[PDB]
């Protein structure tokens, strides 16, 4: 049938929870909790977290996306009571090949041409980031380092980077506690896949490196008795 059920576009185009995070806004410095998960967060997007622990995309070799990040932010601190008074959240898609913020009140939240959105807490925002790929397809499964020269990092192959999401709060006034949970749902459009690949045996042990984990249990099942079935 020519029905979009078992084709590739329906196959990968569902929206899945990636990158649960939890931020707040307190003060300039205030109480010494600034850097780890508070006042801002950068993700450095990678579908390597929870696309069923990298399976359906790893079934193919070469893909091309057109992503739709739908950021669902919510107020973990009782929104029913308060902790939501115009709590405007700022998202930001920092493209690959651009500097990353590492502070809440930092210059690259307001800089030039960095796509940033603002929405109410407890509401959503829909994106459409086009195919930001260095290669003509996303090399999800690549053999080779970056150079025999200086060589950027290692065969993680972050050269075909997709982007980097940044989330922060524009608010003030340390007298109180708030907490905001942000949950982004990636969805891929117009997915064009190439070069089918045999599936993995184990759940993985690394991102980027196609390593199979040590100390394994048997992935295949013993016969219930002998070759004699039933």
């Amino acid at each position: 049938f020519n029905g979009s059920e078992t084709d590739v576009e329906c196959f990968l185009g569902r929206a899945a929870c990636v990158h649960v995070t939890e931020i707040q806004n307190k003060d300039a410095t205030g109480i010494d909790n600034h850097r780890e998960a508070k006042l801002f967060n950068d993700w450095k997007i990678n579908l390597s977290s929870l696309v069923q622990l990298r399976k359906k995309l790893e079934l193919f070799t070469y893909v091309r996306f057109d992503s739709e990040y739908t950021i669902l932010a919510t107020a973990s601190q009782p929104d029913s009571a308060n902790y939501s008074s115009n709590l405007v959240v700022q998202a930001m898609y920092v493209p690959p090949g651009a500097p990353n913020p590492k502070e809440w009140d930092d210059y690259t939240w307001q800089s030039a041409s960095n796509p940033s959105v603002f929405f109410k807490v407890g509401d959503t925002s829909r994106f459409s980031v086009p195919y930001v790929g260095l290669a003509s397809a996303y090399n999800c499964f690549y053999d080779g380092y970056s150079h025999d020269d200086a060589e950027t990092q290692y065969g993680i192959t972050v050269l075909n980077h997709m982007g980097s999401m940044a989330f922060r709060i524009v608010n003030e006034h340390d007298e109180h506690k708030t907490l905001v949970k942000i949950r982004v749902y990636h969805r891929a459009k117009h997915v064009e896949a190439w070069i089918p690949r045999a599936p993995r045996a184990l759940p993985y042990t690394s991102i980027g490196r196609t390593n199979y984990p040590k100390n394994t249990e048997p992935v295949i099942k013993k016969r219930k008795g002998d070759i004699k079935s039933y």
Binding site: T61, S136, D143, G144, G155, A201, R209, N211, V219
Partner: protein, 256 residues
Amino acid sequence: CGYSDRVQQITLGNSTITTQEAANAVVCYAEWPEYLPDVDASDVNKTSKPDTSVCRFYTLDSKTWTTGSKGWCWKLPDALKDMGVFGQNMFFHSLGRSGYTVHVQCNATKFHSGCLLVVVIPEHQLASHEGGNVSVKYTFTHPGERGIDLSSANEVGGPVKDVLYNMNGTLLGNLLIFPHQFINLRTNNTATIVIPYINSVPIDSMTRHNNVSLMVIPIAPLTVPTGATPSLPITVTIAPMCTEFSGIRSKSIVPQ
């Protein structure tokens, strides 16, 4: 007259192989090894055409399929590094387009029982012997002409030698959606795979990037009749067809 198998002269440059038993051909996909990545740039062309002098059948060293053997794995564009005019074009330039034609032949008598699986795996990333958040540092990956040599040659620091996971985490009988052909000693003694060029970037360095791993692995063990030698040879020949390079009128000398 009688049997008329395609065993005539495939002579090509310095290479005059023409050793074909049951000369049936399986190509990787519907795409043949094709030269042109585009038409033109609306300009006069001095395009690097080495197909007149790269299309030789560069054979390899022969490898001895014993009963206690597990498999062999060569990284295909980097197996031919220290050899041929193709290797000197590989170091001499940087970037090149290379479609390959791989002809694996196994000498076997009528009396030998066994089966082989040849398989061409595009962009075969490797699994480490460490098996953690580290892999081989690409010294142990592609020795060239010697292969990874999975048959009971275990080592430390580089790739794993586990044959069921085929350095990939995948599964052995599940590997056949890659291009493949079975060498059945009842039926045939050789196998041919026609490999077109495959990369998301149309032109690429083969010194840096390992396009293809080639694996020949025994699925069924070889049972020779007793009183014979418990070893059979595997010979693999590569004919890089419709091969292109980039560094036209540019490259002077780089020694390594």
